[PDB]
Amino acid sequence: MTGVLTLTRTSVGKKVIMALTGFVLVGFVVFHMYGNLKMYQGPEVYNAYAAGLRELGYPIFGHEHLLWIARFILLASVFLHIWAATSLTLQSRRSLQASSISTVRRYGQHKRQSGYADYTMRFGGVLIFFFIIYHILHLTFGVVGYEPGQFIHPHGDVYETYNNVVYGFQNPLIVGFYLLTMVFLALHLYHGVWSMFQTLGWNNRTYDRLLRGLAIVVAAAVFIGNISFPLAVYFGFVA
Amino acid sequence: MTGVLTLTRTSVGKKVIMALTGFVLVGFVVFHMYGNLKMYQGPEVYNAYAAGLRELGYPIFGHEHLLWIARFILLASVFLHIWAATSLTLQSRRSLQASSISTVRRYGQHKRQSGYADYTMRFGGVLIFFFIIYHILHLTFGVVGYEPGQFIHPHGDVYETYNNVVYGFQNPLIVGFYLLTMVFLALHLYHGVWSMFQTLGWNNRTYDRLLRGLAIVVAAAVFIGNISFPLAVYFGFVA
Amino acid sequence: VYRLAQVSVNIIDQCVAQGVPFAREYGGLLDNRSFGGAQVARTFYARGQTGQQLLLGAYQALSRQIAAGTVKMFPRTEMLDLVVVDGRARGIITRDMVTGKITRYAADAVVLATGGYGNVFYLSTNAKGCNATAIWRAHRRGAFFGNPCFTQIHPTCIPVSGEYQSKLTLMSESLRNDGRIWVPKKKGDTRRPQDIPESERDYYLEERYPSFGNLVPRDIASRAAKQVCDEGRGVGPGGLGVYLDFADAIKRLGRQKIAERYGNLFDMYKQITGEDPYETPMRIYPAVHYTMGGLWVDYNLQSTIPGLFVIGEANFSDHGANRLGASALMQGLADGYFILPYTIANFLAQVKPGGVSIDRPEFAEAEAEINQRIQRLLSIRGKRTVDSFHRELGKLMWDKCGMARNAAGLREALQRIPEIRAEFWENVNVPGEANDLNQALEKAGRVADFLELAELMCLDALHREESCGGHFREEYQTPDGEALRNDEQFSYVAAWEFTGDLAKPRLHKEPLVFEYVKPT
Amino acid sequence: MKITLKIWRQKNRNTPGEFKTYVMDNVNPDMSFLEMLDVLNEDLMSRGEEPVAFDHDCREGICGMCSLMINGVAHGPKNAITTCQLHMRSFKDGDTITVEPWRASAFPILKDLVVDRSAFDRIIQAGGYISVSTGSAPDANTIPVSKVAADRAMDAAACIGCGACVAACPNGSAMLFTAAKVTHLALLPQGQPERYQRVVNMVAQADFEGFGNCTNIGECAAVCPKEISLETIAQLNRDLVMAALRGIEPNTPIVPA
Amino acid sequence: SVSTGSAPDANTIPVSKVAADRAMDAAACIGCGACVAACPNGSAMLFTAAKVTHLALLPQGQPERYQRVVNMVAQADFEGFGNCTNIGECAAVCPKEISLETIAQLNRDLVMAALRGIEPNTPIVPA
């Protein structure tokens, strides 16, 4: 009687919401890795890409209009994603608490045969949340991880995104944090790119292997690019 | 047996044709208000938008090609819309000629309960037709409502659309005509945005309130923008 | 009866195929509910308008045949006479109810499906236009009335607010399964019914009739109600009504479940009367609901007149002395769909098509009779209205030939009916013209036929010296108040023949034999 | 109650009508509106005047005969009821009530308040049925109809054919009646085989009979005695769009006999 | 929701052989609960999905399927089961080899029911 908003009523509907938001977030992650691949072209190309993100369709759309629409869509997707993930994590925790040997163990010898997707997904999701916060504070705003006099904020229509990236991955702690988050995001994609198709019902025996391979390809590409960026910056390949 | 052209055979089919053409025209009206919102950005931004409308997709598309396609689509939509509106208006007029106390009165008392969406739609449609004719003759061609030496025509790739807007809404008669047309177009949108979903059958109990709210939002935004433009120009906020 | 019960299944199949929105279960299959007093759930229903959906399916089939050109529909046209040519019903004489035009139609067969005559009692549950004009004209033309005194009533009907009202809205008779029938003990009580204490409430049907507790049969309970209202109680607007109270049921059962059982009924009662039955007791009063009588028909649904077939409530047919619930719809659909198409074909195959046109002398005589009757009705210009005479006739028939009948009362009614008929034909006011939309003329004709039919009804009630079903004689009843049949002398169908004298019709007994269901 | 009535009085279709004023000194609040009209008719007959003619058979809000525009609203001020179901307690002492017939080109006026509503019959005749003959029906339980679909089809099928939707529609359109029948037949599996033809034919008939178009105003649902929703009109619109996609052409319209 | 005595003839509604085979694959569920036990979330998604797929694949379960799935899913939420992370351990340990395509079918049914605005009924309270 509420319509599509009846999805919030069931756990399966919450997983459908997470599947749609994860579709949006996987698209953004792939496009963001593709955009950040331009740092190897040079500071000019990377800064041109940064400036053109804001001028997306400028002759028709005002400055930062499409960028702000995308930012709002991303914020809504990530908020729905985290809300549904927290709800379902708490539901599964309650489902496990009553019958359990301990608060850290369920069975005496439980043997997993279909992977450890729950552990990796939940822990990596928490890590990705913290990393997104630290990332927006780090590269978008420059208020963390920067010595005084290294971050150049976008003034007017000239961008120093390349300089910010080069001076960002200098502290090995930040590089290690980015690398760990990229490992857990690689696991996140490796499971979720197939899991969103399975959660929406767009899966069967024939396409199961194809969707698993697509998830593997997406996760591998994103992982390789997103660990190439900070390692190249820290080791001196991008300067 | 003639296919979709059978829509022309029935009054409901004419109403469906009007629903589709009104989808097109509502999209154009919203995009037009969004584009004209750049007068407050400045003359440079407004003239850049005017030039980029013609130079749309230029690396792949010729000059004014996409604009001429859009103009042809708009002309077809508005001609089908006006034709079907006239046909349905004449049919509904014939439906009341025989049984009516007068040629201006149907009942000696008719308390209405669901609104007045037949006086507003038809009268505002006639007003919008006349306004579109006058507006094309006014701002597109500058052959009416302009003192000599006040209107500048597109010269090559330079555009003086901002100057035309500033010198157009100087006579308060033009401002009043525009404001009245915007009031009746606000009524048109407030009814038709929902009525075109109802006409195509994309409506039910759950989404009726949602479509009503969407129609209200669209009408309010279009009305506010399209009355802000000439009032600001006439009062001196845009000069 | 066996044919009706046998074709009921085809009736339901046809109704489902036609798109009648019967109640369905969650699995997609049909849902059955039980009537009052029925031991099986054999009833298929729409929510509360099953008759509406059945007639809508039949009307959609009729509209399909009208579009196909096989059926010519003549709405707002009232058949005023039957034309019998060479002993066969070979046409009808009708009047257009808008233009007033008298038309003559000739046919190879004539079917009378004009419903019952329950409006001979002025106060009834039937539609305002229901009449007995067609069947009475056929009876005067040669058709035999089979048991004209067999009338069914409804126990629960919303009473009238004054002498102006002539229709009692039918409420479901399951309302007596959860209510208590009473009237104030004092004859004149100005207190509110809910303010009347329990000791001062005359809970009749409980103080009297201890047997059949809270499930007294409709006939006994309604006779008690009419006796109570005739003694003078003043509970209703005119004193005609009894309190069916739901207060103790609401206190006992959950008000939510009582709502789930009687919500539509309570809403309709509050709309009609302006009183909520959740706080005040509701008022009910008996009204004549059905007529199991009508023109006698044989197994082929054909009347005494060859070529005249009577179907539905207009014939006697399958209901005997009491119509079961959901049987009038069943009988009508059976006759229309699965019986008459066979029997009318059987009749028509033995006769030559055509041969009779509307220029025959019989058509002229019938048309002249109809025109003279209409002109006489319009020319009386008396001081009394048509509804006044109909009200007098209905009150006399309800008091004398209603749920309680006796020889003295029936003789009094047989004396009074000719007097009322003479007063009608000398002192009735029918305004307007014949060639116009004269509703008063339609009412005048219907009441003119009713005044003749009521005499035959009273004569049949007097002749049947027994009680069976709806027909109740006070001289023949069990100590419990039930009907007491005389199967030795009255086990037959009484078909009455019009002899030209309204007070002396000829009785024809059609003996009844029961080889399968033994009388008990 | 003292009640003033401005009643439309028209001698016939050709004669132009006028409003006539009738004062009722005593009106019972429990008395129905049609009962008050009957009392006025008796008073007129006693005074020698011509009684007011109006349509009425069942007086239960089921048949659909009653058709009165009372004080500007079809079937009276109260919604979800008919003229017969309207009682004088809905009015106040000294009130003026304007009684009118249906005003539509396809609904000719025959008398004071009587209206010719055969255009609805011709709309039904133009495919508002399931073309099943007698004796060919399968078993009643052969085709499963879901309870929700049956409930919606009964909501649509509960249409008494009063024509108040045409009367209160500013365009004089039969959209609600046609939509109700189309939705009733379309929601059942028995109405599927000819549904996309049926709607087109029915819509064409409503155009041929002389009804207006649907501006989606919604007065029809406001004054409908049976609370038939605009979802029926949306269902008809979907069916007509789908039939246009299938190239369904309307048949020859049903000509009056 | 079919009562006794109202059933039509057994051959009235044709069920395709592949649909019957899939519905028998889903219907072959012994209710052991090993899917809940091996699922790291303790979810009954395999059992509920098997029943939903069994009834949805036959023409007799069509009238009430989009309600049923929602109700069944809601009941699994009310009874105290976890959510499906699509791990697939339940199908690994299932004695009758119920595939994860049953869970995909349930997901499709629930999405379609949400598109229809299907509201779960009141949960079945333990007696």
Ligand SMILES: CCCCCCCCCCCCCCCCCC(=O)O[C@@H](COC(=O)CCCCCCCCCCCCCCC)COP(=O)(O)OCCN
């Ligand atoms: C359909 C909805 C459309 C959106 C409507 C809401 C959005 C617009 C209104 C609210 C925002 C206010 C816009 C006003 C313009 C702000 C931007 C601006 O002026 O540009 C500054 C750019 O500043 C920013 O950083 C702009 C804000 C963008 C950062 C926020 C990132 C959000 C991330 C979203 C995704 C979250 C993660 C989920 C996906 C993984 C310029 O910097 P500066 O030179 O003034 O620097 C300070 C002086 N040194």
Ligand SMILES: CCCCCCCCCCCCCCCCCC(=O)O[C@@H](COC(=O)CCCCCCCCCCCCCCC)COP(=O)(O)OCCN
């Ligand atoms: C899929 C179909 C594609 C389209 C095919 C047909 C259309 C193209 C062929 C017919 C038109 C060809 C015209 C080619 C030249 C037009 C450009 C041109 O001449 O440029 C001038 C601009 O010319 C115009 O302005 C031409 C008219 C364009 C405006 C037409 C308005 C159309 C409105 C349509 C919507 C109507 C309302 C419905 C929506 C509410 C520049 O100014 P000027 O040199 O004339 O300056 C004069 C100095 N004294």
Ligand code: HEM
């Ligand atoms: C970079 C942004 C993110 C992307 C691209 C992403 C992608 C995905 C995808 C595609 C799924 C599968 C959804 C499904 O099976 O229907 C998923 C599941 C999940 N994500 Fe995310 N996610 C992101 C951020 C987060 C964050 C910030 C959290 C934690 C707050 C999180 C926690 C989870 C959890 C717990 C699940 C699985 C829950 C379950 O399957 O029952 N994710 N993710």
Ligand code: HEM
């Ligand atoms: C090591 C790989 C990455 C690099 C080099 C990188 C680089 C950048 C840079 C330079 C910015 C600032 C540009 C801007 O704010 O508009 C940025 C913003 C952003 N990044 Fe990343 N990023 C990486 C990984 C990620 C990942 C994995 C995510 C998703 C979880 C992500 C999400 C974002 C978001 C949401 C913004 C803000 C976008 C905006 O403000 O418009 N980034 N990134």
Ligand code: HEM
């Ligand atoms: C670009 C400007 C216009 C827009 C955006 C617009 C939009 C709409 C929309 C969306 C509808 C509802 C259609 C439906 O319910 O299916 C509508 C109805 C209508 N429009 Fe327009 N319209 C515009 C200009 C006009 C013009 C120029 C006329 C005629 C002179 C007109 C006359 C009408 C009429 C008469 C109706 C409803 C008629 C009926 O339902 O009987 N409009 N309009």
Ligand SMILES: CCCCCCCCCCCCO[C@@H]1O[C@H](CO)[C@@H](O[C@H]2O[C@H](CO)[C@@H](O)[C@H](O)[C@H]2O)[C@H](O)[C@H]1O
């Ligand atoms: C600026 C250009 C637009 C304005 C100029 C065009 C205006 C012309 C329309 C005026 C009315 C004539 O419009 C004409 O209406 C008639 C009947 O009303 C329609 O006639 C047709 O459809 C109607 C139902 O809608 C039925 O009677 C029948 O199926 C057929 O006659 C024609 O298909 C349409 O062409």
Ligand code: SF4
């Ligand atoms: S749709 Fe409603 S208002 Fe119209 S005829 Fe049917 S019942 Fe009357």
Ligand code: SF4
């Ligand atoms: S493990 Fe398999 S058989 Fe056992 S309950 Fe779960 S789905 Fe059914």
Ligand code: F3S
């Ligand atoms: S009021 Fe009129 S516009 Fe359509 S919805 Fe009803 S017929």
Ligand code: F3S
């Ligand atoms: S193993 Fe568990 S996570 Fe879901 S797919 Fe099966 S219930």
Ligand code: FES
């Ligand atoms: S008289 Fe039958 S609906 Fe009113």
